[PDB]
Each structure stands twice: as C-alpha cells, then as structure tokens.
Amino acid sequence: QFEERHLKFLQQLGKGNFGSVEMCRYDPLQDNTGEVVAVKKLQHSTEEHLRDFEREIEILKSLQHDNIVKYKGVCYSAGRRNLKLIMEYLPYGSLRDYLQKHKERIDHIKLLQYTSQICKGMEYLGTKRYIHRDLATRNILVENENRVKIGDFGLTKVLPQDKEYYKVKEPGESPIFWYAPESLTESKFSVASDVWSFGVVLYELFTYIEKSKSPPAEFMRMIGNDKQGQMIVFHLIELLKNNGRLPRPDGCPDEIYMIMTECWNNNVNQRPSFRDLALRVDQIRDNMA
C-alpha cells in the first residue's frame, strides 16, 4: 500500500541480524506533510530469509493490542524483491537505551507499569499461539513515558496445533543468556520458555542496564571468562541445571526477585503464566501506591 518512490530516508533506527529499521518519511505530496514511519528491511534476501520475513509480516498484521507495535503496510519492487515492512514510528527508542539514559527518573513503580504492559502483550501473543522466542529489552520500544510495546517479531513462530512446543535451531548464533535450559538443550520453544525470558527481562529492568550487570557479563563471570566457543554454552547448561541463577539486582525488592526465580524454574511446567504474572505485578504496584 506504500510506494517506495515516496519513502524518504532520514536515518537508521536499529540494526539486528537479518535486517534493520530506518526512520523514513512517507511524503507522497512532496511537501513534508507526510508522516514519519519506521521501515524494517533485510540485510540479505535469501528466499529462506524472504519467506520467513513474509511469515513475520503476516504475523504482525494479525496482531492488534495496545502493547504491540502497529503494522502500517508493505512496500516492494520490481518485481517482488526489496521487501520492506512499514510500522508506526516510536520516538523514544528501545527500552534498553531509554532506561540506561534516564535511570535517575524511573522508579520501581514505573518499571512495574512497563512489566505489566509487557505481560499483557505476551499473553495476547499466547492467545494466538505465537512463540516470540526473543523477549528482551532491546526488543521493547517506548511510545511515551507511560506506554511500551513489543517491537520486533523476526524470530516469532506459530505453534502446530497438536503440540505445545516448537523445535527450531537457526544458523548463526542465539541470545543464549535469555534462553530457557530446554531451549539450549533440545531447542524447544514454548510459552514457558518465553516466561523464562521474561524473568530475564525483569532482571534487566531492575539492573537499569548497568553494563557490568548484564546477563552475559554476570553469566560469564559466573562460569569464568576463559571459556570460549561452544564450550561456553555447555558450561552454561550445567550451571543452569544446578540452580545457578543471575543474582538479585541492586535495590530490587525480594518480592520481585522471587517472581524472577519462579520464572527460572527448571521444571518447565512449574513456571507461572503471563496472567498470574500480571496479577502479582499489579498487586505489588498497588501495594506501593
């Protein structure tokens, strides 16, 4: 519905592994009346990458929720190459950088607001039987001081109807420090692995993205910085299956840390649901207020 002719490049907004996102201005009248949108593009167009990008586009088109980034349209050439996804432009960027540059104005009540918003978005994803597979603060965008949104779905898969997990291993490497143990060992991805990752997101939020306190830093100072290559993953595996966990972040109440640890249960069936998480987080936020 968008013609590439009229898309005017302004700057680059974010760079991931198979594509990137540009701030551009859709201005068909050529008078700077058009609106500023975000455009996700591909860095290499294989047909594997093209088919997965199309599946992701149709996934995002099927979503509507106040904590999901808004699909706007598609744009292409010549042909059916150069595929580009148009989305609403969120002007405060990723939650990672926003929180790392405003750490002195975001108290625990606002972090709990963000947390409950993420949980509502994730539950909405689950009702459609989608597995996000990449829940992290770098993948959360900020609409304003009171609203955040899940903003990338490049790894999201739909569950088959007879099973509740999804087995997939991608080429290249993976954000293994957000991954549940069953996703490192058997490549199984489900709602419960998304709950593990959300526990990690909670940890991130309450570290305020301190650089020494990142999950990679903490995990590889727990296993030793001498490990390299595949062995890293291996050691991580055993560390997690001996109940080694990320430490409680500085200033984080024990109620929150216990939510985190309950989402890091090794038994994949003893993890909380996103609705139970939203309930507990809302009750804590109400006790603080």
What are the two backbone dihedrals, phi and then psi, of residue 84, each rounded to the nearest 5 degrees?
-135, 140
Residue 17, marked binder: yes
Q: Which of residues 144-163 bind ligand R6V (CB under 6 A)?
A: 151-152
Q: Is 63 in the site for ligand R6V (CB under 6 A)?
A: no
**93 near ligand R6V (CB under 6 A):** yes
Beta bridge partners of residue 77, listed in sequence order: 81
- Find the shortest distance in angstroms from Cβ 225 to ligand R6V: 27
**67 contacts 118 by C-beta, under 8 angstroms:** yes
If binding is defined by CB under 6 A, does position 20 make contact with ligand R6V? yes
Q: How far is the CB of 93 from ligand R6V (least distance, A)?
A: 3
Q: Is 89 in the site for ligand R6V (CB under 6 A)?
A: yes
- Indicate the residue among 38 and 180 with the shorter CB distance to ligand R6V: 38
- As a whole number of angstroms, the distance between CA 8 and CA 6 comes to 6
Q: Please indicate if the annotation marks 53 as binding a ligand.
A: no
Residue of 2, 22, 24, 38 that binds ligand R6V (CB under 6 A): 38
> SS3 sequence, the chain?
CCCHHHEEEEEEEEECCCEEEEEEEECCCCCCCCEEEEEEEECCCCHHHHHHHHHHHHHHHCCCCCCECCEEEEEEECCCEEEEEEEECCCCCEHHHHHHHCCCCCCHHHHHHHHHHHHHHHHHHHHCCEECCCCCHHHEEEEECCEEEECCCCCCEECCCCCCCEECCCCCCCCHHHCCHHHHHCCEECHHHHHHHHHHHHHHHHHCCCCCCCHHHHHHHHCCCCCCCHHHHHHHHHHHCCCCCCCCCCCCCHHHHHHHHHHCCCCCCCCCCHHHHHHHHHHHHHHHC
87 binds ligand R6V (CB under 6 A): yes
Nearer to ligand R6V, 17 or 283 (CB): 17
14 assigned to a ligand binding site: yes
199 forms part of the interface with ligand R6V (CB under 6 A): no
Residue number, 94 or 113, with CB nearest to ligand R6V: 94
134 is catalytic: yes
19 is in an annotated binding site: yes
Among all residues, whose Cβ is closest to ligand R6V? 14
Catalytic residue among 134, 162, 276, 286: 134
Name the minimum Å distance from CB 23 to ligand R6V: 7
Stretch 104-143 residues interacting with ligand R6V (CB under 6 A): 138-139, 141
| Catalytic (active-site) positions | 134
- Which residues of the chain form contacts with ligand R6V (CB under 6 A)? 13-14, 16, 19-21, 38, 69, 87-91, 93-94, 138-139, 141, 151-152
Residue ranges for the known binding site are 13-21, 40
Residue ranges for the known binding site for ATP are 13-21, 40
